[model samples]
Target: MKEYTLDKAHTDVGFKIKHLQISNVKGNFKDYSAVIDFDPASAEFKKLDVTIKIASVNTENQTRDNHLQQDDFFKAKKYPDMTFTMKKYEKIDNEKGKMTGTLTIAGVSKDIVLDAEIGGVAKGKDGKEKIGFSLNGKIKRSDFKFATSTSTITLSDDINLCIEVEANEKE
Candidate 1:
């Protein structure tokens, strides 16, 4: 079982949601980490676990960002982290795939599936093997019991998640 560490400078974990039923508001979690265990012969991931710091949520506006931390939203004080644990990965050819995982947010957990695209593997200038992935998914905010009071008319229920990861094999 070989391990890999995220190349933080090249990775991004972010989301987008419809606001006011007309426009979209985008945000991202700045502080996060992942544990990846890969099996080269099998061409599969043995383990994929990610943890994101909820307080690091940023939407480009301080006021809106602060609101997300309050009880109405993330309730960051009580539940400071959102996590994802991969249960399975189904390869659909060489570049496309699907991933099913358990996503936990604000103490609520739900199963979700994400579409994955392999960005290929290569060696960096330093000669370490690196792999990249682009993942996208959608989830209902209500499923996680997040901001239930806000009607869909103002804040949409669907949230779009996007993650780009570049990881280096541990040596």
Candidate 2:
């Protein structure tokens, strides 16, 4: 069993979604961490749980980020955090798998699944072994009803996410 801990320095927990039928608006939670137990030798995510402080999302524009945390979006003042607890993991292809989990956001918890790919595993300069993974999925913003601009003509309600993470075994 590999006691996986997030390598926050080298990993990015970010998301992006198309806005106004044009460019993508990207944001990331700056204050969050995860704990995972991954065994590449067995291709398993035995235990996985993540907590993200929704109020920490940075969009470069402070005003926009702050607005995103308001009632119109994450509702950070009330909910404060988004979290996930993994329920199942199964390998579909070599280095690829499916993971289903309970996702809690904006005071709502629901089941969501992600297509997970084992990015790689290797030895680092620090003499520690590291494993990486990327998960991608789409969620309808309307499902969470986090919209300030009801202009559907400008933006699609679907939000796409590609979550990247790198973990190392704890000492």
Candidate 3:
């Protein structure tokens, strides 16, 4: 397996969820790290793990963002990190397919599948090997034991995730 180090500056881990059962509210986890170990030639991945710092949640609104870190959502103080661990990786062709994994949040773990696409791999000018991927998926908030509704605002059960990441092969 080849090890790859994530380039945080070139990666985006964002998500969207319906607000008030109408429009969407988007947010991103600004602090996170990932490690990937896979062989593209063989279309196999032995390790794919990511940890996100819950305190970094940002939605461009201070109040709402702060609330997300509390008990209603992430409960950042107690469950400070969320993580994903890949269980299997299968390449459909040269570019895209499915990645099955387990996602944990607030101490709850559940199996999930991410629709993944390879944005291609190439050698960087700095001599490092670079690889990119675009991934997306949806998850039900209730499945993770998160509150799906309140008397005033009811959030949609499905939370959408969109991730774009670039990684360089580790020396």
Candidate 4:
């Protein structure tokens, strides 16, 4: 497998969840890092690891964002980071596949599978090879023991994840 460095400037890790069983609330982490070891030609991944800082969560609203870092939500002070480590990848076609990984949140770890799609592989302006990937998944917040007195009444249990990654091939 070839090593690829994540291009943070072009990557986004965001999530969506329903609020009060009504509209959706979206948020993203501003600080995170990923290590990708993949072979674009064969559609094989040797390693995929991502770590996101809980304190970096942003939702545009300060009050809501601050509350998310509290015990009712992420508990940022105790669990500073959430992580994902890929266990396997199954290629369905040239551009579609499934990724299975262990996701750890708030100290709870669960195995989850994500639908994966290859955006493209091309050479950048700097003459370096780059590859892009889009991954989508959903999980129940309760699965990770994210419980609070008002959570069941005010928030939806299901959380949608949307991740876009662009990585440069390491020479």
Give the best candidate by lDDT. Answer: 4
State the C-alpha lDDT per candidate: 0.87, 0.82, 0.84, 0.89
Clashing residue pairs, backbone N/CA/C < 3 A, model 4? none
TM-score of 4: 0.83
Off by over 4 Å in 2: 1-21, 125-127, 148-151
Ranking by lDDT: 4, 1, 3, 2
lDDT for model 2, please: 0.82
| Regions of candidate 1 where Cα sits further than 4 Å from its true position | 1-21, 40-43
The TM-scores, one per candidate, come to 0.83, 0.80, 0.82, 0.83
Off by over 4 Å in 4: 1-21
- Residues 41-96 of candidate 1 have per-residue lDDT tens digits of 44566688999999999899999989998998989999999999999998786677
Q: How close is candidate 3 to the true structure, as a TM-score?
A: 0.82
Candidate 2 lDDT by residue in tens digits, 1-171: 779999999999999997544777887778988888887677778988999998889878888998887766777888999998899998897589999988888888778889999989777889877888998888776666557455555666877878899888788
TM-score quality measure for candidate 1: 0.83
Tens-digit lDDT track of model 3 for 1-171: 999998999999989987544678998888999999867675555688999999999998999988888777788999999999999887787688789999999899999999888888788999777788877999988788776444224577888999899888897
* Residue pairs in candidate 3 whose N, alpha carbon or C atoms collide under 3 angstroms: none
lDDT of 3: 0.84
Model 4 whole-model lDDT (C-alpha atoms): 0.89
Error of 4 at 2 (Å): 93
